[PDB]
Write a protein that binds this DNA or RNA. Structure first.
Lengths: 50, 204, 120, 67, 86
RNA sequence: CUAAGCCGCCCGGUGGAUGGCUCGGCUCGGGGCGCCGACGAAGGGCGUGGCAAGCUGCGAUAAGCCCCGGCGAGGCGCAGGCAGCCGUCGAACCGGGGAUUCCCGAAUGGGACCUCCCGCGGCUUAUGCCGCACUCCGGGGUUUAUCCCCGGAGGGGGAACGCGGGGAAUUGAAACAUCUUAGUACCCGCAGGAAAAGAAAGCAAAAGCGAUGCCGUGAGUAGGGGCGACCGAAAACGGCAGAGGGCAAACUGAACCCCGGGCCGACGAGGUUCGGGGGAUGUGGGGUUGUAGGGCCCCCGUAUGAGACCCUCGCGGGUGAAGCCGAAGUCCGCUGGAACGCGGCGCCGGAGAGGGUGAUAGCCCCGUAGGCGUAAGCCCGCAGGGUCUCGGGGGACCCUGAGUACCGUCGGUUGGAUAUCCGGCGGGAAGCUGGGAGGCAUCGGCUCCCAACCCUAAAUACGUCCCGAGACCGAUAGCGAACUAGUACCGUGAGGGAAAGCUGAAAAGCACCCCGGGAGGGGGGUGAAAAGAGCCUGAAACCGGGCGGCG
RNA sequence: GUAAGGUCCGGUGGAGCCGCCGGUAUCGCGGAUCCUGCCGGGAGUAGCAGCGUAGUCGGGUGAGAAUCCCGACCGCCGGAGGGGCCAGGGUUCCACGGCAAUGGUCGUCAGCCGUGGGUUAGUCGGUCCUAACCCCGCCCGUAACUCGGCGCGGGGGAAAG
């Protein structure tokens, strides 16, 4: 929305920062056992809890 | 276990059985004996009775019979024990055996008495078993050897504890399972003068 | 310095999750006959400088200096015990410290000397 | 930087050192994004922990003086 | 807020670099709990310069950014070179 | 030399069964340990790593900071990388003690359509600090407004267990209404590491016992019940543990308590002095019980002796964190990628429990049998300094709990039956020259007891936790979760809730060559074996090809 | 071996397994419109029409072009398919580099995947006032409460007033 409160904006910012892929160096360090995390999200498909 | 899942039944009117299913997707079946993740129909229960009672006089008679069978040449050898070089059954030894405190001394005394071969065979028989007992801490299935019965404990228990298959007990704590391991009677036994004296005092 | 439980699950859990001050002691190796007679000690944890002879494995009978010790994996590296990669570079073979023998001691450490004196 | 040398200095130059270290921390954080030719990646962590040490011994000295 | 605990890091983006040369303006990422007065005091006291104006915003990633305009007598390029921004 | 098609075997793809493994579950006698919070809890939001998304840990000092001890050369979490830095001035790690500790939250100076905002007084030069919520207790001032000030309390959280109240229906009775389900599910209130009960106005009747609780048994008995279905005890006896005390009153009458200073004492116990608040509507002393006890008065007899408790300026001892020591082969020959295997030769053993180590190991390592050490704290003793307690015979006088005991009636509850217990309404005593109980009521006898005030350890219940154990399961099993699981995801919400373990001894994780836009393919290497990461074994169903028979 | 089933040979596999006596059990699969997982015929079939039937010619990038880009021609909407903007969404916005997957076909394109960026207020909105209405304190009721309630005191309540 055009008008937002700061607390909601900060929570949305935290979710935005969370939504990213696993580092490639993490993948090689873990030997391909860790390839993803449960916080991956698609804006038009998976909606935020808020 | 298995009774934590909240479920609802669709009922008739749909092409599938009347089974209890979850209220959210994927709507698997739950809380049914024949459903994955459900309760067990008749599981084991702690309240079950496992203790078995034995009359005191009947147990005394069984102990008498085991002690008598200890001195049976046919039964001892039929149980697998090596008594080829044993001088006599029952084997009564002087009371000085009670004071032996070193395992090397006990080994030499046993070699003299002719029961070392039984310890050797017990060690040879001991081995790794088959099944999940290995996962549960029962990797080895050890064998039984000569049983030492002494009137008093003056160090013989410590001097003969370590030998494979060897059990040392005081005649006051003697038991039917001590005399007949695994329900098969005729265990090779070494008695002392004091043990025989106490056994005579008891008559049982 | 205490493992009472006889349950394999608990023994293996202790081995896997042992703190570092315990992993330090879990890296002991036996001393040769000469060192054993000289120091009246049967074994000691391995140090990098120590010269070590391999008693088991593909490199049995090979002597060399220790180059690296890893407590997390309970492994060590000895110079000369190496594999060749496909490209051609040489890499070290991790060897359990219990499979080797100590034939020379890097005994410049006062605390290591304290260990020897305490255990003698 | 070690506590043995930190304890030698007084509170005033401890504050000055904290100020300088915070300046350097900000500058290194800027350079981190500016350029990738970072010889020492651990400089930021070392500076942070040095500042924390300075504050800790500063409060210890304050307690000693008050007592 | 303590003058030395407001600034987190300079901004080294294309936009910030262009502003430095064009409008005599520095760009900092500062603590979100810092007001314009705090930012002005921090910049002036740290860099021994006089600041004309401060404009603050909060980025979508939750950080606080501050554009600080220097007085004409002071050059933002000099301070950028001092800090190594170039 | 049959097109399609069907059956059988072989090879290949798809798939993930089976077998083996297991740092995870589940259940247990015994043992340990059981609260946190206005000095701001639990729970949550947001931040924090050089590369950092999840989990974990931490909090603007943010996978951490400081100090005293253990350990002794490596370390930088799950998590096998790059680059760096930390450590011999002793790290990492472990036990103990400190520092920092954002916002919301009982949330508390005042507000929340967004865990973010807006104020009033004092100190502060300024950077900034300490107070300001409501309902009360003990005081002060005054503005007499509860206005201001000082000291002190309560709120919220906790898996099960506990105490006090409110309280259904499905169901059974083969229908159903008294009844049962059931004082159950659920709801409201109040505490602790346990809670509650507890010392006879009791039980019992040839005799007697002697506070309470829990266990066995009494016993499916007495007894209740459309006397249907069904419901249902206690005393006694055998055990665990055992412990008893204090007020009100008579009488005396400020000899008293608390707070804040001062001294003697040792910093403590104890003794003493001053100011303030309580106190004659009674502080303190005394006293606590039944064929009676106590007071008061009279007489006899003592203390010159015998206890009990309090304190540590001091000394010795025990226990007590990390932890330290703890025997014996890595001997020869074979199989093997690798000996823990086979044959031969030896050794220790208070140690042949269990685990790791490239196969199955008493002697390679860790451990085990058996011993040692330990700061703080806790407990006992010595020595010294204090406080307090300690006997019988007579009386003629005094005291011994009130809307209480109890009766009538109504509702509930109970096995309580005309004879259980709680509560409402009307009535209501004696009070020591007294009163109560003994299963309908009353009269007489006999036996037992003294309510209407209070406290009380151990034996007992539970396990959010820990040590230990297992004829428990072995990845569709076992807790829902062996793993970034109460996570992802579903619903506005109350709430609901998954799937998913395994290369190899060692990455030695395929250098180089030909082709392809690339994904990949073919050579050639590694490995005991591709087991090639789409990685242990690799079944069935299904699909493609080859082969034998039919067509 | 009547049988439930046992044992042996050839092959794969790489670390455990069984005979006998005596006990114990979540102990025996064809069905429950059974539960969980995997795969078949239907089938290279339906659908990719109907309410707005839109593309063609030269040139360009590219391994690859009906589908991407530029020019012309021909068309659709034109009181809405054009312009501005709440609620809701929360990075979908911008540039560069891409096509394993997503896009009803292809795709060099993209609301897609990778990397790096982007939101600047004394004047515009919230913040101030109060409306319907709501909350806390005292007070009364309730066995009690996080429950019901008149009166008094305080506070909140509109991003289109």
């Amino acid at each position: 929305a055009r008008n937002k409160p700061l607390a909601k904006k900060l929570r949305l910012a935290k979710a935005l920062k969370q939504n990213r892929r696993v580092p490639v160096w993490v993948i090689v360090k873990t030997n391909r056992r860790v390839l993803t995390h449960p916080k991956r999200r698609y804006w038009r498909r998976t909606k935020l809890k808020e | 276990a298995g009774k934590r899942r909240v479920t609802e039944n669709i009922g008739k009117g749909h092409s599938m059985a009347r089974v209890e299913r979850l209220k959210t997707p994927p709507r698997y079946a739950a809380f049914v004996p024949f459903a994955r993740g459900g309760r067990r129909t008749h599981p084991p229960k702690v309240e079950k009775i496992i203790w078995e009672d034995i009359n005191k006089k009947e147990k005394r008679l069984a102990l008498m019979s085991a002690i008598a069978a200890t001195a049976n040449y046919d039964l001892v050898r039929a149980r697998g024990h090596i008594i080829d070089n044993v001088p006599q059954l029952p084997l009564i030894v002087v009371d000085d055996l009670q004071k032996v405190q070193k395992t090397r001394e006990t080994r030499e005394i046993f070699k003299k008495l002719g029961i070392w071969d039984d310890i050797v065979r017990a060690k040879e028989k001991s081995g790794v078993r088959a099944g999940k007992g290995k996962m549960r801490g029962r990797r080895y299935k050890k064998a039984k050897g000569p049983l030492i019965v002494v009137g008093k404990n003056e160090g013989i228990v410590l001097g003969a504890r370590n030998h494979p298959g060897v059990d040392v007990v005081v005649v006051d704590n003697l038991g039917v399972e001590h005399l007949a391991p695994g329900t098969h009677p005729g265990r090779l036994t070494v008695w002392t003068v004091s043990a025989i004296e106490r056994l005579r005092e008891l008559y049982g | 310095m205490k493992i009472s439980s006889k349950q394999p699950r608990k023994q293996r859990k202790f081995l896997y999750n042992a703190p570092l001050h315990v992993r330090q002691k879990l890296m002991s190796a036996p001393l040769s006959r000469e060192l054993r007679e000289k120091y009246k000690v049967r074994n000691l944890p391995v140090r990098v400088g120590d010269k070590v002879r391999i008693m088991r494995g593909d490199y049995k009978g090979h002597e060399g200096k220790v180059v690296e010790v890893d407590l997390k994996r309970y492994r060590i590296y000895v110079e000369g015990a190496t594999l060749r990669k496909t490209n051609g570079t040489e890499v070290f073979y991790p060897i359990h410290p219990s499979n080797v023998m100590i034939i020379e001691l890097n005994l410049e450490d006062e605390k290591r000397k304290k260990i020897i004196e305490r255990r003698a | 930087m070690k506590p043995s040398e930190i304890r030698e200095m007084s509170i005033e130059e401890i504050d000055a050192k904290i100020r300088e270290l915070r300046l350097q921390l900000a500058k290194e954080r800027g350079l981190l994004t500016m350029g990738t030719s970072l010889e020492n990646p651990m400089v930021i962590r070392n500076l942070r922990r040095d500042i924390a040490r300075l504050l800790t011994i500063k409060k210890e000295k304050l307690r000693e003086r008050e007592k | 807020m303590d003058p030395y605990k407001v600034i987190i890091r300079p901004v080294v983006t294309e936009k910030a670099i262009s502003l430095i040369e064009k409008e005599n303006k520095l760009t900092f990422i500062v603590d979100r709990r810092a007001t314009k007065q705090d930012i002005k005091r921090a910049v002036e006291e740290i860099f021994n310069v006089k600041v004309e104006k401060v404009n603050t915003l909060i980025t979508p990633r939750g950080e606080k950014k501050a554009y600080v305009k220097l007085k004409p007598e002071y050059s933002a390029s000099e301070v950028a070179a001092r800090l190594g921004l170039f």
